[PDB]
Structures are given as C-alpha cells and as structure tokens.
Amino acid sequence: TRLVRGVYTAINTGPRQTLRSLIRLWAYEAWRIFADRLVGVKEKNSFEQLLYETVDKYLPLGNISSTSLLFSGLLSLDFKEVNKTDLVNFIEERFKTFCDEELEVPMVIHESMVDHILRIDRALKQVQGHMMLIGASRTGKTILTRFVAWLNGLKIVQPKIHRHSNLSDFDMILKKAISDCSLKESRTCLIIDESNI
C-alpha cells in the first residue's frame, strides 16, 4: 500500500511520462519501500538482481542501482528524474547557504549522502510521514534531518532531555511542540535521539 501511495505521489507531482520512465519510477518506489530496511551489501545485490529478474520477466531500461536512481523535486517544479553533477552542485550551494544561516559544520558532499537527503526529503514530504534513521554515530543523521527540514521549511525542535529530568519535562516539551504545531500552524519536525529516551 505504501508502494502504491508513493507511485501515486510521484505520478501526480510529475511531468509526462514514458514506459521506461514508469519502470524507473516503480523501481525507485520499490527501492524506497522494501530495500531501505536492508543492512547487508549481499542483500542489496540480491534485491537488485531480483528487480532485474522481475522487470525482465513481467515487463518485456538503464542501470537500476540505488546510486543510479535519483528522483527529486528540488531541481524543478515536478518530481522528475535528475542528473548527478547538477544536483551535487545545487545541494552544495544550498548547504553553504544553510551553514551561513543556521550553524557552521564542515561536511563534504558525496553520492550516498545525497541519496540519503533525497530519501529523507521524500519521506518528510508525505503526509503523516515519520522516519527511523538507524546508523552508526557521526554518520550525519540529525544534521541531515535538520538540513532537509530547513529545505522544506519545517521548523526544527529538539527536546532538551538531560540528567535529573523526569516525565514531566518530556510532557511539557511535547505539549509545547503540539501547541506550536496546531494553534500556531507552524510545521515542526521533532527529532528524538536514542539518548533522549
């Protein structure tokens, strides 16, 4: 069902499409629905060859790998396929502006982090969409979430949970965020870390 809804969003917010474009779009949606929970590189290769076999056998097309499929609506008014170097340059300039405006941190733009930004943007674009970033420390999870939230106009709220803090503080900050979300019509993006539980 999530795959169907993602295909609907991509079709509705997209330009005129061809059959190869439908295949690429459906494969990207399958990648973002089924293959994100995968952990192993062997499992990723198995999923890639499975997608090869499925498309070849049921739909009688370029490379379909994860880094070769970048669907985004950042570069235009529609959710279309984008190139690589132009997207990297645009996100470089946007990150330089973000470092100028909010906080300075020296991170280097590369392929996998661009793909992760695109999928985080896709997840946060959905209505009632929530994420569970799972990865090693200092990989760039919360700062990427902050950058994508700034790109989409989301307000950033981080709970100030620390030592000698109880459930009353958590309820207070949650109620404040809820009131800001509803009464003040301010789009907020709460970020809960593992250390904040």
Binding site: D36, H110, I120, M132, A136, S137, R138, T139, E194
Partner: protein
C-alpha cells in the same frame, strides 16, 4: 535517530508495534568503502601532497578500494581506509556498526599536520640554502682580496 540498534532501548524502539508500523525505516548503517574513499579524496585534494616521485605498486583489483593508483592522493586515501578497516577488525566489534568519526578526525589531523610540516620543511631548507649561499659568497669575497 538511533546510534546503536543493539542496545535494549534501541531494541525497544525498533520492536515497538506502532513505531515500526508508522515510521519509514531508513538504515543508514556504517559507511561503505566507496563513500569513505570519495570523501577522503574530496577533502585531501586541497593540500600539497604530491611533491616527490611515486611508483605505482601491484595490488589486487578487489584489494584496492579507489580508482587505480596514479598519484600520492589515491595511495594515501587507500592506506587510510584499509588501516581503518583493519583497526575495526582487530577490536572485535562484531555486527555493531562502526562509527567513521575516528576516520574523519584522523584525516583532518593529517591534512593540518602535513600542511604545517611541509611549510616548516620548505622554510628550513630555504634558510639553510641562503645560509650556504651567503657563506660561499663570503668565501669568494675573502679569496678575491
């Protein structure tokens, strides 16, 4: 945001019914070798690195992680990524994800220290050469008189 998905709290977050059924799980994982090679190249290509001769070695295709070795930069990014992988292998971390923060910190320390050392070495050699030249000029002037 989950750092170690093996601990009890993170296992409770993952195995909770509605959190799993509502959130789009995006497994970042540890960085793979291509990502670390790319970021290492992109943050060491701005330093004076290749200033001596270099002979390309003979290594296996799967043993090298970057493009085939041409300059000092490919060699140093390969040696850094391979040593980081070996160091994580020696610490017996298991299936626990490996933080690449040590790699980034070491690479920043490397670029800063190589810049400082290259500047100091060039200044010292210029000083010793101008001193030797001044001594030779003084010797020539003394021999002329």
């Amino acid at each position: 945001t989950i750092c170690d998905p093996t601990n009890n709290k993170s296992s409770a977050m993952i195995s909770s019914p509605a959190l799993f059924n509502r959130c789009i799980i995006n497994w970042m994982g540890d960085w793979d070798t291509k990502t670390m090679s790319q970021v290492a190249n992109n943050m060491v290509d701005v330093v004076p690195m290749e200033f001596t001769d270099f002979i390309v070695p003979e290594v296996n295709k799967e043993l090298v992680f970057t493009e085939p070795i041409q300059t000092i930069r490919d060699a140093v990014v390969n040696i850094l990524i391979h040593f980081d992988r070996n160091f994580y292998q020696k610490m017996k971390v298991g299936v626990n994800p490996r933080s690449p923060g040590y790699f980034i910190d070491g690479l920043r320390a490397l670029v800063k220290l190589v810049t400082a050392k290259y500047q100091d070495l060039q200044e010292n050699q210029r000083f010793v050469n101008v001193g030797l030249e001044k001594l030779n000029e003084s010797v020539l002037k003394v021999n002329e008189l």
